[PDB]
């Protein structure tokens, strides 16, 4: 169906400690496939997916010249930014930047996006039409100007609807078994005791992909919510994801409960019933 390749870039100044560190990481949905890290002995963009592995030199050469480029342009923005805000030397700062394009259930493009932020704060994002910017912040127009002007949103608008989607499809193919297939959620249930009157009931979901997913409790067919701990969907560490939703329950009433699970990798959504 729908997919999305998008990039993450993060340079972080470290005064005195030589040059700032730069990191680039690529994803197609929730599958990492390339990376960069000025501190690694690689000094080259690296493959993290079997399907990108099968790209000849032309690829890895280019991706390094470009990450390198990115690696550098941010390196400066870091101080240029520090200027726009006039900040002392002693003290680190972080410049982030993400961009990617998505595609509908037809691989013919859904939308493109390009955002920037200085010090974990929105700096300038590209409006949804991809022809205008949003410089939420005053001396953030200094960049908005240099860009809405120099015509970046123009040849960038060409990348998003162009190359971006094109390569997204090329990857989608080379990685059919990995990218286009799912890993249903293996699920179970734990029951920890809280005390004489209460006892927690936790509904697990491990080894699944995409990381997208929902988890809910239905005591007698009455969904619960605010009183339900809900850990963020966490990385299993092998490509799959796990997540659990637990709820404090009246000791001796567990049977009333049923866990509800939704996941693209499940035909019908499963309704796990604690006491069958």
């Amino acid at each position: 169906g729908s997919h999305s390749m998008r990039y993450f870039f993060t340079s972080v100044s470290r005064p005195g400690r030589g040059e700032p560190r730069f990191i680039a990481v690529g994803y197609v949905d929730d599958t990492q496939f390339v990376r960069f890290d000025s501190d690694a002995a690689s000094q080259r963009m690296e493959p993290r997916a079997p399907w990108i592995e099968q790209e000849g030199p032309e690829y890895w050469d280019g991706e390094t010249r470009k990450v390198k480029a990115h690696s550098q342009t941010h390196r400066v923005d870091l101080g240029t930014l520090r200027g726009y805000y006039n900040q002392s030397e002693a003290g680190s700062h972080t410049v982030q930047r993400m961009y990617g394009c998505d595609v509908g259930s037809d691989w013919r493009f859904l939308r493109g996006y390009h955002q920037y932020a200085y010090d974990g704060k929105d700096y300038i994002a590209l409006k949804e039409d991809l022809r205008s910017w949003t410089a939420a912040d005053m001396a953030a127009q200094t960049t908005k100007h240099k860009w809405e002007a120099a015509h970046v949103a123009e040849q960038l608008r060409a990348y998003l609807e162009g190359t971006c989607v094109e390569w997204l499809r090329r990857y989608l193919e080379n990685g059919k078994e990995t990218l286009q297939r799912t890993d249903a959620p293996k699920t179970h249930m734990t029951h920890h005791a809280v005390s004489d009157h209460e006892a927690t009931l936790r509904c697990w979901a491990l080894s699944f992909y995409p990381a997208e997913i929902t988890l809910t409790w239905q005591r007698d067919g009455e969904d619960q919510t605010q009183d339900t701990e809900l850990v963020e969907t966490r990385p299993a560490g092998d490509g799959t994801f796990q997540k659990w939703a637990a709820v404090v329950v009246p000791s001796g009433q567990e049977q009333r409960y049923t866990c509800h699970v939704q996941h693209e990798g499940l035909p019908k959504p499963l309704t796990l019933r604690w006491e069958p």
Binding site: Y7, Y59, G62, E63, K66, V67, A69, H70, T73, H74, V76, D77, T80, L81, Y84, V95, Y99, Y116, Y118, Y123, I124, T142, T143, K146, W147, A150, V152, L156, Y159, T163, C164, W167
Partner: peptide, 9 residues
């Protein structure tokens, strides 16, 4: 692949 060129803020 990667967009290019990338621009300074």
């Amino acid at each position: 692949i990667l967009k290019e060129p990338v621009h300074g803020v």
